[PDB]
């Protein structure tokens, strides 16, 4: 019942409350940092007006002669991965959901699918209104053009998937209502406000923030679902999850590519502070909200996986590892 859920949540209450504490004093450590670096940040926001990525190129009109092969090729790579929800075979899924999965498994997959749906539009804005709009180079535009479109198909997949395992309208209701009362939600909100929504923020910094959102904030969910591919279940889900993970991996990689073209890059200290805080909120999800034990996973190995994914990201930004851990999940070798 909710008895076991408390037992499990309790196994990591001390570890969890630490991350919480750690994250609590970030809204303050940040205003301080900003208060004391006003002169420097003011110069960065200025030079931003000199970054090739962030400014039009009126001499370029042919729109073809590949100036940024790295990007375009990224876009083409994406453009060749087009896929639809109509390709997902769920026929054999509803059976597995009722005959091979326990009540704890369904309770985990459900909430996990719900988290996905609770953030399929919030990110729609970031990609455009706070990104695509900027970056005055066509290659990148094409990419973001295609990303937003693919993200709309991911949003469909989550609803479709949820609409197949959780048909009962009432339950689907409680599902989200119970998913809106999770501390992590606000915590993620605060993080955003700190590195994305807050004015006087650098493009370069948002890039790391965006990438964190794409390759760190859900890494655990994607991981927890390949864990089902192992036990040989929910091929409808694990198929879609595999495709979406590939997609997100790609979008992240793209963030790192643009980053590399920036003349003035964010202090590695800041790049690490952004990715690291993400990792803490992510872990917290599985140490507070949904315990991986619910589906036979080891709390400790999950943390490691997240920390691994961040380090892998940190490195794709020029920074150096921070957790230096190794990938615990062999199945995530991909």
């Amino acid at each position: 019942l909710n008895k076991e859920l408390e037992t499990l949540r309790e196994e990591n209450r001390v570890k969890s409350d630490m991350l919480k504490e750690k994250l609590s004093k970030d809204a303050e450590n940040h205003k301080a940092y900003l208060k004391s670096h006003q002169v420097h940040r003011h110069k960065l926001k200025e030079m931003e007006k000199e970054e090739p990525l962030l400014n039009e190129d009126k001499e370029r009109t042919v729109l073809f002669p590949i100036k940024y092969h790295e990007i375009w090729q990224a876009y083409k790579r994406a453009e060749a991965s087009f896929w639809t929800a109509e390709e997902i075979d769920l026929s054999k899924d509803i059976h597995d959901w009722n005959n091979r999965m326990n009540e704890n498994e369904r309770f985990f997959i459900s909430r996990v699918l719900a988290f996905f749906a609770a953030s399929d539009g919030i990110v729609n804005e970031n990609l455009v209104e706070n990104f695509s709009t900027e970056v005055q180079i066509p290659e990148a535009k094409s990419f973001y053009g295609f990303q937003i479109m693919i993200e709309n198909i991911h949003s469909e997949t989550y609803s479709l998937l949820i609409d197949t395992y959780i048909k009962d309208p009432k339950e689907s209701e409680f599902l989200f209502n119970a998913i809106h009362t999770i501390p992590e939600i606000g915590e993620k909100a605060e993080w955003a406000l700190r590195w994305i929504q807050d004015a006087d923020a650098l493009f370069g910094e948002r890039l790391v923030a965006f990438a964190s959102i794409e390759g760190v904030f859900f890494s655990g969910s994607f991981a927890s679902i390949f864990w089902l591919k192992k036990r040989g279940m929910m091929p409808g889900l694990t198929f879609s999850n595999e495709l979406i993970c590939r997609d997100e991996g790609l979008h992240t990689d793209f963030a790192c590519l643009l980053f590399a073209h920036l003349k003035n890059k964010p202090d590695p200290a800041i790049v690490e502070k952004i990715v690291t805080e993400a990792v803490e909120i992510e872990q917290r999800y599985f140490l507070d909200a949904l315990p991986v034990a619910l589906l036979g996973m080891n709390a400790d190995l999950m943390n490691q996986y997240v920390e691994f994914v961040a380090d892998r990201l940190l490195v794709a930004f020029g920074n150096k590892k921070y957790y230096k851990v190794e990938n615990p999940f062999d199945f995530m070798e991909n």
């Binding site: 729109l63 073809f64 729609n124 053009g145 937003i148 479109m149 469909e156 989200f176």
Partner: protein, 265 residues
Amino acid sequence: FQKERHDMKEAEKDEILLMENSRRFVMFPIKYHEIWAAYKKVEASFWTAEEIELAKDTEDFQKLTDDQKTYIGNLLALSILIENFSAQLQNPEGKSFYGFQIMMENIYSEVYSMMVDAFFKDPKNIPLFKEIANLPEVKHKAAFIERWISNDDSLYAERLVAFAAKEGIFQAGNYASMFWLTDKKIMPGLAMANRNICRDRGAYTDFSCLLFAHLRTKPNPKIIEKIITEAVEIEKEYYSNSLPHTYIEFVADGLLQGFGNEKYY
């Protein structure tokens, strides 16, 4: 029809279309079947530049009349806000259709370029108009969008009708031309690329006729015919001033009927 426009402005609030959809987390129990089926329809037609062969298609280009080469030049050079409309349409169904449309527009912008490249050589030197992009005729096109869409004093239903003009009326001349030049064996490539864009452009125009159709408060029947005509004038213009028929009127009427009006021509 001045006073009544004031009422529609206050009425646009009862439009469930422009209204909120909040609280709908899961989206599959579809609320907008019509626009959704429209989105599925364009999603199924997804194509790319790679699916187009211009090789052994460039043979029939340099064999064209000395000036027929100049035509295509501008035709491509020309071709080579959806976000605002998408921002007003409050639902997953509509925004999905829009996200797809701008996505496809970039592929058109690529295929077009490829032609400019495989035909008029890498150098954009041959393309004349490319240097004088902002020339009279376009300024008139830009004014139209500056009249019904950009202008603050405008209504959603109106902006919709204008948008369709800009989507279906306008470049109708272009396709009409290439359908000719690609009539019977000549240039199989530009032919498929054209057949497609025209098909999708048609759908993108219909989508606005579909939204409009679901509007509870339609604008005055005269303003509609007043918006189309202007675009038909701005169309005939450069369509017969850039390079060397009255096909526009035909289309102009079908669209007129599309919004529930009388055929003006």
